[PDB]
Each structure stands twice: as C-alpha cells, then as structure tokens.
Amino acid sequence: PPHGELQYLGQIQHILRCGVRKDDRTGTGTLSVFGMQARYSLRDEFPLLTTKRVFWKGVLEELLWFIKGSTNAKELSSKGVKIWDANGSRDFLDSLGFSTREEGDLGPVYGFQWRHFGAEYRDMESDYSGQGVDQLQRVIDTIKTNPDDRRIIMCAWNPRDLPLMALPPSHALCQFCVVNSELSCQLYQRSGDMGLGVPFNIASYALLTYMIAHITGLKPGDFIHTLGDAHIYLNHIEPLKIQLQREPRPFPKLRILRKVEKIDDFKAEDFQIEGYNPHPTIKMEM
Amino acid sequence: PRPPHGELQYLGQIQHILRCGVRKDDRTGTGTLSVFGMQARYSLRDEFPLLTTKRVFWKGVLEELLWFIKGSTNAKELSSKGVKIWDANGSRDFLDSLGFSTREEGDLGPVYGFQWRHFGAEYRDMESDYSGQGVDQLQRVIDTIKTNPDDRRIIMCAWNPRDLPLMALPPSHALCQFCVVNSELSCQLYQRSGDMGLGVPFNIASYALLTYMIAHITGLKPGDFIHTLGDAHIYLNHIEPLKIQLQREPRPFPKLRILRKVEKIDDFKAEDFQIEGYNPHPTIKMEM
Ligand SMILES: [Cl-]
Ligand SMILES: [Cl-]
Ligand SMILES: [Cl-]
C-alpha cells in the first residue's frame, strides 16, 4: 500500500527544499510554507508515525484530558504526561500576567472550548456544568441524527478567550463528515511545528475521530490535516534529514477493548495500540 | 511533480467530484455529489483568478465585498446596488420561517459584515449603531500585518457558534488566515461547505479580492489565495451545465487594477477597481 506517512515525509521535504526563512519566537529561526493538506486513512489502521517513536501515552492521556473538560495542567501531569506543565508553571503563568491564577490553571484552552464554548471562564476549579456550548456532545448528537449535515464544526479558536489562554491554540477548528457510515475529520491547524508537534497532532485527531466514530456507531474514514503556517525549526533540520532516510513500516492498529456508551466514559485502559514498530526515538528540542 | 495552476485546479476539482463523489441528500430533494476535503492554491501574482471557462458575476463579487466592509447586515443596502444574491434570505417569508417575525425585511442577522467589523458584540438589529462595539477583526488584521508581519495568529472568524441561531444562513466560510512572506500577502480560506457549480467560482473571486484589498492597504504584493474546502458538493441539476464547462478551453486569467492609492480599507469604492483582459467563455446558467 502507499504509506500515508509519506505525505508527512513529503511535506517535510517540500519545506526543506522550498521553505522560506523567518525569525522564530526566541533566537533560533524557522523554515515556513503556508497552506498544506494531507489525507490520513483510518480504515483498519492508525496513523501513528513509524519513522520515529511517537509518544502515544501523551496522545491518549491528553485527549481524555480535553474530553474531561480539564484546564488544569496537574490533572494531566498526574498521569505521567508533562507536555503542559511548562505552560502552567508559576513563572510561565506570571510571564503572561496570570499572577492571580493558581499554578496549573491554563485558562480556557481546548477542554473548555470543546465542552463549554462561550461560557465566561473564572478559573480551573470552577463548576461549569450547563455553562457554554458543549460542542463535542452536539457534534456527537448531530452525527447520530443527521449524517448529511454540512455544519458539524467544533471551534477552539475564540478571539475573546485568546488573551486568557496560557497557550494560543494551534488547532482552530475541526469539521466532521459522514460518508456511507464512515466518519471523516478535517482539522484546520493554523500553526504546525512539523518536527515536534505535527506527528503527535495527527495521532491526536486521528484518535478523536476513532472515539467519535466508536460512540456514534460508525467507522473511521479519513483524517484530513490542513495547515496554515507549517514550520521547521532550524534545530530540527538535522534530526529530520536523518528521519527522511528511514523507511516507514506498516501503520499500527488501534484497539478499542470495550463498547463505550458515552464520550465521557472512555478510559486509557480501553485503548491498545497493536503492532506499533517504530524506528528509534528522535528528540526534537527547540 | 508539477501542481496544476490557476483554473485547472478548479476544473480538476469538478472532475474529481463528478467521477469520485458520493451521492447525498439535501433539504430540498435535489441531491448532490460530494467529496470532503480539497485544497487549491490560486496565485495572485500579476493575475486575478476570475474564472474563464464561464463568465463570473464580477460586479456582484465587488459590491458584496464593499457591502461586507461597511458592516452592513441589511440585504436591501446590497440590493439597491444592483446585486440581489442576499435578497431571498432577507425576505419576509424566509425570515418568518426562521422565527424572526419581529425583524424588518432585509435584516440578515450577524452575517459576515457584522462578524468582520463587530465580532463579539450583541446583535440587536440591522439599523443599530454598532460602532465602538465588538472586535474590528478586519482593521486588526491590517494593523497586525503592518506591525508584526511574521505573526502566526492573523485570523478573521465568521463562524461564531453563539451567533449562528440569529443568522439568516450559517456561513459557507468559516475562517480566513493571512500570512506575510517576503513582502507578499497570502490568504487561506476555510470554506466549510462549497457549492462547486454556482458558489465556488464567486467565492474564489471574492477572497482573492479581499486579499488584493488588504495587500494594497498594507503596501504588500498579493501572494496566493489558498482555497480549502470542507464539504465540496455538486448539485445534481448542475452536472450537465458543468459537463459543458469542462469541454471549454481556459484562457489566461485577467489582471485586476487598483486605480488610486487608498489609505483605509473603508475608503475603497467600486470605481477604485478595474478588471482587464477579461476574456471569459459565455455565461452558464445554474439554478439555486
Ligand atoms: Cl452566489
Ligand atoms: Cl479590456
Ligand atoms: Cl468565445
């Protein structure tokens, strides 16, 4: 078969070859293309990148943490996933003028946007039951009842909430589509750290589509990844040139071990990645 | 591995839906053929992507954008300019059918114009003084381009979930993202739902135009218009007219000319724009 991974590799090539140079956040530098899209097939496999070891336990735990509606970094850290701890640091929170917020409070990030869109954020402990739009449940509801719907959209980019977030979201919006009882997802990702971020991003949304499919009684179709600003940190070029030399191996398969009724009831234990045989880990730093 | 450029992209999308699309139903009975997820890149470099395989309604494109820019949500303000495309959705019947019986006819709700200029604001009606309210996204986009051209956050939103149930229609165009590269301004549109026969050609012209405008206001050269689709659909009653469109030879895109310097985006007038070398094949009729 033609490996969907090649699209990611192809994209990294194309940026190495045609990308333009810019000044990054803090010192490094970047190579950027604007506008990309790749189609990742979800039928009888899972797009977990094989040319390097992807941190799946990160993927799964963080997704469940979004679904939990959590905005507290420690709730995820308690699971052994540290990716958001930097962002909820005492220092880091102060550096964004969040002096009054408790360590770990990330503001209205994905968990909140997904489960309580439009609600007025207070803090990471507040009860937000019945508050804001529960986009994720409405997406699930609409999928079950109206599979032709052209408006099954979940938004995480909220202009009002931006000054309040500990991290501006990479992922502006998702759109779901049903075709002959297959569920497709398209993510508009406004900023893609191609070396570090994107592989994990692909798995994350691929895993979301598996989950929503599973509860609406459908089959995973395609994940379409669309990028706005797709960048490579100079820092990643060398480890990436080596990665481009690796040959992908068949995608693993994802197992859902019990029938789950609701999106809220999923647990880590319910997911087994089978046959994940990656090439050795690559540590991107920047 | 050369990509197709200009109009062939769109002709290739059409073929793709005709050959590979899947039959789906709609709220009328007509039906569509449908594909999910496409992208095309229309160079705006010394040319303007107004389709040639059929004459496009250029005047309408132009007037509709001017209409968005001044923050109008009254279909009659556009109407009085000789462009009717929003009239139906502002009619007494369409309004009653949406539960807005208290609305004067022509009142569309918080559609593009409101969203671009007064985002986050409380929509009251179409005659209301909104100035000073909501986020002027359009002016912020221009300002950010001028002050941090490298910004990765230059997004204009129109899909507001909270405003959706007050809108005549949910927007086809969810969001725009801008990008500055080397003194060239690019724009990517996420169009959640594309009517490929009737809407898409107009849609492309529309957002290429907005790109040309903002590029001008900020002293940049237009770069690319990247068109990204969610649901790309062809209504069954357009298959035949589109089959005819596919046999036609696309001729080179026209150039767009801006005839004076303009300082603010609000000052553009219809007279500031001129399409040149527009050599389209004849109008093809497609019914909504
Ligand atoms: Cl139209
Ligand atoms: Cl002429
Ligand atoms: Cl002719």
Residue numbers in the entry:
A (entry chain C): 26 to 311
B (entry chain A): 24 to 311
What text comes from the article?
To target the monomer-monomer interface and dissociate the hTS dimer, we applied the ‘cysteine tethering’ approach to fragment-based drug design. We selected the ‘Y202 pocket’, which accommodates the side chain of F59’ from the other monomer, as the most promising region to target. We therefore made the Y202C mutant and screened for compounds able to form a covalent disulfide bond with C202 from a library of organic disulfides. We also mutated the active site cysteine to serine to prevent the selection of compounds that bound at the active site (C195S). We made mutants with single point mutations at C195S and Y202C to test their functional and structural properties as well as the double mutant, hTS C195S-Y202C. This was used for the ligand selection according to the above-described tethering approach. As expected from removal of the catalytic C195 residue, this double mutant was inactive, but X-ray crystallography showed that it takes the active conformation of hTS. We employed the C195S-Y202C double mutant to capture compounds that, driven by some affinity for the region near residue 202, formed a covalent disulfide bond with C202. (a–c) Unbiased omit map (blue wired map contoured at 3.0 σ), showing the S,S(2-hydroxyethyl)cysteine (CME) chemical modification occurring at the mutated residue C202, and the mutated residue S195 in the hTS double mutant C195S-Y202C. Four molecules, A5, A10, A20, and TPC also bound peptide (D186-R215) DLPLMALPPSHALCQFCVVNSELSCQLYQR (sequence C), containing the engineered Y202C together with the native C199 and C210. In agreement with the described computational and crystallographic data (see above), Y202C is the most exposed of these three cysteines and is thus easily available for disulfide-bond formation with the RS fragments, being therefore suitable for tethering experiments.
